[PDB]
Amino acid sequence: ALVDSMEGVGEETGGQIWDPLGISEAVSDEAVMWFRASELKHGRVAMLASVGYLVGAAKISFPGELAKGVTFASVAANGPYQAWDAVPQAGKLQILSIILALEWATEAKKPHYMRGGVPGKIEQLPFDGIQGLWAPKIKFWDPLNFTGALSAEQKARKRKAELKNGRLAMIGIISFITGHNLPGSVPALDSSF
Amino acid sequence: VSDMEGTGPETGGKVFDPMGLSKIASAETLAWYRAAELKHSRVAMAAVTGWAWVSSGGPLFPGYLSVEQGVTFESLGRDGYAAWAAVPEAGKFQILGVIGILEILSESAVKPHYMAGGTPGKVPLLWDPLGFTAKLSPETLARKRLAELKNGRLAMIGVMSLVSAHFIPNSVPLLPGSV
Amino acid sequence: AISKPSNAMPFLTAPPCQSSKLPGAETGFDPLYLSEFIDIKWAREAELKHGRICMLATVGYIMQEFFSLPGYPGYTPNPIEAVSSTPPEALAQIVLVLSIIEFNSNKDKWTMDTMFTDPAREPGNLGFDPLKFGENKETRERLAMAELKNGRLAMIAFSGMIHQTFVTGKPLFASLNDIFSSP
Amino acid sequence: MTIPGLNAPGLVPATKKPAGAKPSFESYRDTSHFWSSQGIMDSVPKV
Amino acid sequence: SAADGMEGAAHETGFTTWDPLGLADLGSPATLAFFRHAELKHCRVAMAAFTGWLVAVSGVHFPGLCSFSEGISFEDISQLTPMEQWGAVPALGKAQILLAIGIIEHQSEWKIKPHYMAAGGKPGDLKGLKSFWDPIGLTSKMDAKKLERQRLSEIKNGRLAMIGIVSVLIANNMPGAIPLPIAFPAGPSLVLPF
Ligand SMILES: CC(=O)O[C@H]1CC(C)(C)C(=C=C/C(C)=C/C=C/C(C)=C/C=C/C=C(C)/C=C/C=C(\C)C(=O)C[C@@]23O[C@]2(C)C[C@@H](O)CC3(C)C)[C@](C)(O)C1
Ligand code: KC2
Ligand code: KC2
Ligand code: KC2
Ligand SMILES: CC1=C(C#C/C(C)=C/C=C/C(C)=C/C=C/C=C(C)/C=C/C=C(C)/C=C/[C@@]23O[C@]2(C)C[C@@H](O)CC3(C)C)C(C)(C)C[C@H](O)C1
């Protein structure tokens, strides 16, 4: 089984797969590749969101202006939750468009992950190889090539750390949002966020 | 990291990296660090020399920054942040746009890119137009590269000293209280 | 357990177009199987003609809202109203020129039986290639597939612009701004 | 307009009544599309 | 790419062909020759256009009358903005200017029998139209090395000139495009013939 040959197994659940409900046992291998790809994407998005939400909760913002009328401090004033609503529309559209470009270019790689490729290994240069499209070759992950200095075992341990941190952030960001929605649901969040 | 330039006699003839930042760096990461260090050295040297020349009562440019908008170089202020604020927004925009065109040209026009097997922080587009170091020996060129890195790091320290003196009222000992 | 299913739809049988040497034939998208009834070469000729017309038309539609011929009579950013506003003689001359072009390009080949009698005639190959992109045979498949797909997207897009202007009464990007405006 | 997510909330909570007695049969049969005269007359296409 | 032996690779793009979208790989060598000829024509026309635009803005004009029938003079045309001068030219004057340009174009296509699209075309070469290019023999003194340098200078100046003419013609109509705040002359960015 493909579920028996991954890095996500951790001692926190013993030296064994954590599939309480047998979801991985009730699906074919292709769905397991999709699961790992989506798990890592969710984890990474979640930790980006978690650190961003903490930064917003601390009222930390850049010195300058997010538009020609709004200030970074002004749009951050209300809090992290309403900050996205207070962001100008064109900026939201631009973030969504660049995320669209990223998740289209990464999807359009033919080894893929569902059809015979490493799940979670986003192609480091999504926009390369596209005919009649040009990008500056800023490779998406490790643009300055930190992981090159690591050995294979080192980066395997760090992939395990990635899975652990991504799952923890998956919990954490939703903890932030749920604490904002239901007051006292997550007692660690003050009224500031 | 041990084969790169920048080390001098002032640190035991050895590398200065207390916090291990070079141990997590491959060849490409080290090239990026060197490119960033050199570009910061260049920018900081120009910045600190300009700030010193302006705020030290040095000569200013002759006439009008904007003949139409009515801003003389003397009336700009002879104070760094205040002068930059008083510069017209169009002037700042075209300075930054020219620098951006230069940066894009630098990235796209220096073949073997510094992050793909090229020399870090070299710009054949902008260096020695006339003749200056197109004929020097390969040991004096290395010596002057080391000098560049050294006094460039000193310029980084100096320009951030000026910035701290401006923001924090009196943070630098031997700098005025109105930087 | 379909023996020869459509590539686009595995739950439908292979149409005649799928087992064909046309550009884009490796898609098998024909739920109504109109390739069986319609001659495939005629249908591809019409496909490329409509795609070319509509991929001119979409650019014309989007750029007529913004730009005008200097001092042209009866301009209106809404092209639907601008058709009536503009002189009828302009549209008459345009239709006459296009009639001349179609007649001369399809001389004695205006019908299913008449056209494609000669084997060398290819669908859409009316000989229009001044810059000679087709002499480079490596990129010919790319350009043919690209023509087909962009023409299809342009047919759909022109329908979108036309019916959006019908809905709103305002030109395309004005309606787009009104959609992407404040609540 | 209100793009859901961009310039407005996404899913919005619904308005609800906190419990209540059983509506009488004639209360909703007289408004149903199939067992009401006005319901039948309103259960027609439009254009 | 196919645009490797072609001259045009500059000092500002390393010394490699700048074809980010790979249009030179598209199509035939005939297509690339058409692209080169169009590049050089746009170059040359842009140099002429910027020089004429500077002439119009400066107000230097020929002494006399454009047409004694309509009474329009070079001075009256000079009073308008540079793009409005074309509208101010007499209609027959525009017609015969376009006739001269069309005749030159037709002879360039016709009398230069080894065609730019055809094999051995020399796409930039319009000399062959005798006494059209360099009537004074100024280029005769030069050799192959200086001729190649001057061809590269032509290409660079012309690319810059077409960017420049687009910039000046779009600056006033599109405010804030070119950052330099100066009263660029008014008028349309595009004009029709006649
Ligand atoms: C940064 C910012 O904000 O603004 C900037 C940028 C921005 C916007 C682009 C601007 C612009 C416009 C620009 C830069 C326009 C550039 C125009 C340009 C570059 C125009 C070339 C004309 C050349 C001609 C007519 C040459 C004929 C030459 C001929 C016919 C010869 O006979 C040459 C000759 O060699 C032969 C063949 C033989 C020799 O024996 C003799 C000589 C040597 C004579 C601004 C506003 O200005 C400034
Ligand atoms: C990672 C995502 C992202 C990318 C990759 C990206 C790239 C580029 C590029 C280059 C490709 C250009 C040339 C460009 C230009 C502008 N961006 Mg933009 N941008 C991103 C995100 C945001 C956000 C969140 C905002 C924003 C904005 C602006 C404004 C301000 C206009 C103003 O002063 O009103 C201008 C001119 C703000 C906005 O929309 O303001 C209404 C705003 O909030 N951007 N942006
Ligand atoms: C290194 C950067 C740089 C470059 C490479 C560069 C090149 C050119 C070129 C040639 C290519 C021309 C033709 C040109 C023309 C004008 N420049 Mg410009 N310029 C640069 C920087 C600045 C700054 C800082 C200012 C400035 C200005 C003006 C004015 C306004 C005059 C007035 O309004 O009186 C005019 C006409 C001032 C301004 O716009 O002030 C509101 C102003 O402060 N420039 N500039
Ligand atoms: C390509 C350049 C060019 C060439 C090679 C060329 C040659 C000749 C020849 C020899 C073969 C003759 C005999 C001739 C005669 C006249 N030219 Mg003419 N001409 C050129 C350009 C212009 C322009 C720009 C204008 C113009 C005009 C007139 C008028 C005035 C008529 C009048 O009073 O209206 C007369 C009599 C003006 C015009 O047509 O005004 C309506 C006007 O504006 N021409 N022109
Ligand atoms: C497959 C393929 C391609 C493709 C494709 C693509 C992208 C195709 C896209 C097709 C697409 C996008 C098709 C939309 C149809 C929309 C319709 C019919 C809307 C009707 C809408 C109606 C009838 C609205 C009616 C009303 O408003 C009225 C009048 C008043 C209101 O009171 C009530 C409502 C709101 C109901 C390539 C990539 C281009 C090439 C390749 O080779 C082959």
Residue-by-residue DSSP string for C134-171: GGSTTTHHHHHHHHHHHHHHHHHHHHHHHHHHHHHSS-
Taking every pair of C-alpha atoms in chain D, what is the biggest distance, in angstroms? 44
A131 touches chain E (CB under 8 A): yes
Place of tokens 């001389």: C107
Reading the block at residue C90, the tokens are 């302009």
With the most atoms of ligand 5 within 8 angstroms of its CB, the residue from C30, C50, C55, C167 to mutate is C167
Place of tokens 């635009």: E53
CA–CA distance, A193 with B6 (Å, rounded to integer): 46
The tally of CA atoms less than 13 A away on the side-chain side of residue B15 is 12
Cβ separation A149–B24 shorter than 8 A: yes
- CA–centroid distance, C160 to ligand 5, in Å, is 7
- Answer whether E153 contacts ligand 1 (Cβ < 6 A): no
Q: Other CB atoms closer than 10 Å to residue C51's CB: what's the count?
A: 20
- CA–centroid distance, E85 to ligand 4, in Å, is 16
Cβ separation C69–E192 shorter than 8 A: yes
Q: C121: annotated binding-site residue? A: no
Per DSSP, E15 falls in state E
**Contact, C152 vs C66, CB < 8 A?**
no
**Contact, A152 vs A142, CB < 8 A?**
no
Say if residue E124 is exposed, middle or buried (CB neighbours under 10 Å; 0-12, 13-18, 19+). buried
**Contact, B148 vs B38, CB < 8 A?**
yes
Q: C102: annotated binding-site residue? A: yes
Return the bridge partners of B66, or none.
B71
With the most atoms of ligand 5 within 8 angstroms of its CB, the residue from C141, C163, C164, C166 to mutate is C163
D11 touches chain A (CB under 8 A): no
Residue B164: CB partners within 8 Å, gap ≥ 6? B171, B172
| Whole-angstrom Cα Rg for chain A | 20
- Answer whether C59 contacts ligand 5 (Cβ < 6 A): no
Residue B8: CB partners within 8 Å, gap ≥ 6? B146, B150
Residue E42: CB partners within 8 Å, gap ≥ 6? E158, E162
What torsion, rounded to 10 degrees, do the Cα atoms B29, B30, B31, B37 define?
A: 110
Please choose, from the candidates B6, D6, B77, the residue with its C-alpha nearest in 3D space to the C-alpha of residue A84. D6
Q: C142: annotated binding-site residue? A: no
Say if residue C58 is exposed, middle or buried (CB neighbours under 10 Å; 0-12, 13-18, 19+). buried
**Contact, E83 vs E165, CB < 8 A?**
no
The tally of CA atoms less than 13 A away on the side-chain side of residue C66 is 7
The tally of CA atoms less than 13 A away on the side-chain side of residue E97 is 10
Q: Of all atoms in ligand 2, which is nearest to the CA of residue A95?
A: 2
The tally of CA atoms less than 13 A away on the side-chain side of residue E123 is 20
CA–CA distance, A183 with A190 (Å, rounded to integer): 9
In angstroms, how far is the first alpha carbon of chain E from the final one? 42
Secondary structure class of E73 (helix, strand, coil): strand
Q: From the centroid of its chain, how far is CA A118?
A: 17
Determined by cryo-EM
Q: Of all atoms in ligand 5, which is nearest to the CA of residue C24?
A: 42
**Contact, B45 vs B37, CB < 8 A?**
no
Cβ separation D3–C182 shorter than 8 A: no
**Contact, A163 vs A43, CB < 8 A?**
yes
Return the bridge partners of E12, or none.
E14
CA–CA distance, B33 with B31 (Å, rounded to integer): 5
Please choose, from the candidates B90, B88, B58, the residue with its C-alpha nearest in 3D space to the C-alpha of residue B74. B58
**Contact, A114 vs A33, CB < 8 A?**
yes
**Count of all residues that appear for chain C in the document:** 183
- Answer whether E93 contacts ligand 4 (Cβ < 6 A): yes
Number of inter-chain CB pairs under 8 A, B vs E: 23
Q: Which amino acid is it at D21? A: A
Q: Where are the beta strands (DSSP E) in B10-114?
A: 64-66, 71-72
b/e map E31-70, b = 16+ CB within 10 Å = bbbbbbbebbbbbbebbebbeebeebeeeebeeeebeeee
> Which residue among E13, E16, E180 places its CB closest to the CB of B90?
E180
- Answer whether E138 contacts ligand 1 (Cβ < 6 A): yes
Helix H or strand E segment including E13: strand E12-15
Helix H or strand E segment including E44: helix E29-58
Please choose, from the candidates A79, A133, B42, the residue with its C-alpha nearest in 3D space to the C-alpha of residue B34. B42
Chains D and B touch (3+ CB pairs under 8 A): no
CA–CA distance, E37 with E3 (Å, rounded to integer): 13
A85 touches chain C (CB under 8 A): no
Q: Where are the beta strands (DSSP E) in chain B?
A: 64-66, 71-72
Reading the block at residue E1, the tokens are 């790419």
Per DSSP, E125 falls in state -
Cβ separation C182–D1 shorter than 8 A: no
Q: Where are the beta strands (DSSP E) in A20-135?
A: none
Cα angle for residues C89, C90, C92 (degrees, 5° grid): 60
CA distances from D44 to B17, D34, D37, D38, D41 (A): 80, 11, 12, 11, 7
Per DSSP, C118 falls in state S
The tally of CA atoms less than 13 A away on the side-chain side of residue A185 is 12
- Answer whether E140 contacts ligand 4 (Cβ < 6 A): no
Q: B34: annotated binding-site residue? A: no
Reading the block at residue E3, the tokens are 């645009």
Long-range Cβ pairs for the range C105-111 (8 Å, 24+): none
Chains B and C touch (3+ CB pairs under 8 A): no
Strands B64-66 and B71-72 turn out to be antiparallel
Q: From the centroid of its chain, how far is CA A119?
A: 14
Place of tokens 């202006």: A65
Ligand nearest, relative to CA of residue B102: 3
Q: Give the closest residue (by CA) to ligand 3 atom 28.
A: E180
Q: How many helices (H) and strands (E) does chain E have?
A: 5, 1
Q: How far apart are the CA of E116 and the nearest CA of chain C, in angstroms?
A: 11
**Contact, A139 vs A125, CB < 8 A?**
yes
Say if residue B51 is exposed, middle or buried (CB neighbours under 10 Å; 0-12, 13-18, 19+). buried
Please choose, from the candidates C149, C145, C107, the residue with its C-alpha nearest in 3D space to the C-alpha of residue C126. C107
**Contact, E129 vs E104, CB < 8 A?**
yes
Secondary structure class of A14 (helix, strand, coil): strand
